[PDB]
């Protein structure tokens, strides 16, 4: 069947990706030992989309855990469901990228890209005909942004007609760990717009805001922040695992959202999100699901989507729900705030119904849309880059490791070209 492949990059992508396999194992009822529990038919039919048989009845994930430092691969295998991944699937680095994109992309990830491209190809020709690669990686950090973009460069040259979904977490404006945030961020942006079929963005500062005001958690640990992102991780690709009344692919989402190849940046949201004291009193009905999903407080990216237009949006629905309130209420949100949707494309919404509700929720939804409210986030990384580049700050760590300043000058040139054709349609 159609099989999709996960690649974890950076310490962010290693931990997020390792918890992505928690919720897929939860949907598919797989024990940490690799066996299956539940004894249900369609839960196990198209298991091959994420898992491979290991002639022992265990299901190994088709994932590539990969980093420049063994601190995070040790933490994945020590934690829960850590005895599930293949040991060969861990590609170990030893020096560790010191939050430097130049050594991630040219000099230290270069002797690691050959080892990991062999692993990615190993899980590729072993099957009939794949669908593509969807990855999870970091932008603020060196081992994610510097070396993960190398792998996207390599797999596009060998598999050209496939799909590059990237779940890319971005640096935060307000909270600022990793003092060189925009350097590792922008150097992977222009090397991903010419490299990825679709990019869809995650922000830790918006994930903090969701878990504060809509989840009502006083002490949000990183495992909690890795969970409500992982709900959207399982959502986008759930239609290829369970049947439904209107099925779809990531091929379907790519063709039916983006109008031009230069823009493929989506927004990711998930619903329902309901607090501990609130699950009893809130009626999970589809009109309640659909305005929560169209709310800036629910947005996993901290770009305010009411400050720009929605160009094209695609939303699944996952569960046993009636199809009047599948389609006519996105007509209603097309109509009532018609000024928040673009004019030159009529009927800007898309739907696809899956028949199996997720674990504990009778119905759920994920928002995937190339809203053109992304300019204010590309500027908030632009103006901190230009502020730290006109003083020539922190450039001896970059120009001294095998790259010239002309690579920087074409980075703002693709940045400005990308945002000029965003502001064109708004």
């Amino acid at each position: 069947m159609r099989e999709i492949v996960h690649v974890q990059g950076g310490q962010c992508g290693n931990q997020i990706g390792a918890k992505f396999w928690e919720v897929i194992s939860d949907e598919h009822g797989i024990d940490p030992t690799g066996t299956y529990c539940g004894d249900s038919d369609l839960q196990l039919e198209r298991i091959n989309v994420f898992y491979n048989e290991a002639t022992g009845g265990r299901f190994v994930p088709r994932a590539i855990l990969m980093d420049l430092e063994p601190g995070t691969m040790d933490s994945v295998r020590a934690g829960p469901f850590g005895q599930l991944f293949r040991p060969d699937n861990f590609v170990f680095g030893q020096t560790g990228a010191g939050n430097n994109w130049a050594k991630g992309h040219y000099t230290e990830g270069a002797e690691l890209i050959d080892s990991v491209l062999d692993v990615v190809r190993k899980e590729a020709e072993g099957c009939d005909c794949l669908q593509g690669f969807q990855i999870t990686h970091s932008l603020g950090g060196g081992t994610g942004s510097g070396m993960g973009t190398l792998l996207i460069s390599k797999v596009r040259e060998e598999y050209p007609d496939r799909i590059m979904e990237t779940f890319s977490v971005f640096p935060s404006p307000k909270v600022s760990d990793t003092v060189v945030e925009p350097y590792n961020a922008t150097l992977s942006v222009h090397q991903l717009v010419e490299n990825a079929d679709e990019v869809q963005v995650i922000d830790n500062e918006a994930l903090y805001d969701i878990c504060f005001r809509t989840l009502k958690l006083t002490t949000p640990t990183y495992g909690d922040l890795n969970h409500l992102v992982s709900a959207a991780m399982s959502g986008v690709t759930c239609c290829l695992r369970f049947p439904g009344q209107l099925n779809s692919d990531l091929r379907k989402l790519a063709v039916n959202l983006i109008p031009f190849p230069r823009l493929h940046f989506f927004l990711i949201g998930f619903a329902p999100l309901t607090s501990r004291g609130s699950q009893q009193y809130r009626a999970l009905s589809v009109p309640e699901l659909t305005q929560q999903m169209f709310d800036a407080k629910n947005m996993m990216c901290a770009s305010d989507p009411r400050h720009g237009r929605y160009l094209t949006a695609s939303a699944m629905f996952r569960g046993r729900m009636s199809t009047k309130e599948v389609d006519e209420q996105m007509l209603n949100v097309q109509n009532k705030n018609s000024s928040y949707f673009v004019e030159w494309i009529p009927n800007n919404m898309k739907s696809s119904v899956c028949d199996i509700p997720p674990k504990g929720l009778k119905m759920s939804v994920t928002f995937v849309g190339n809203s053109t409210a992304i300019q204010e986030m590309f500027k908030r990384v632009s103006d901190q880059f230009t502020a730290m580049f006109r003083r020539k700050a922190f450039l001896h760590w970059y120009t001294g490791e095998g790259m010239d300043e002309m690579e920087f000058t074409e980075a703002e040139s693709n940045m400005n070209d990308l945002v000029s054709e965003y502001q064109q349609y708004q």
């Binding site: 495992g223 969970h227 409500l228 501990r276 674990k359 504990g360």
Partner: peptide
């Protein structure tokens, strides 16, 4: 996790 109990809520 508390996010696991909350997202998957039955009782």
């Amino acid at each position: 996790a508390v996010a696991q109990l909350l997202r998957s809520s039955a009782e």
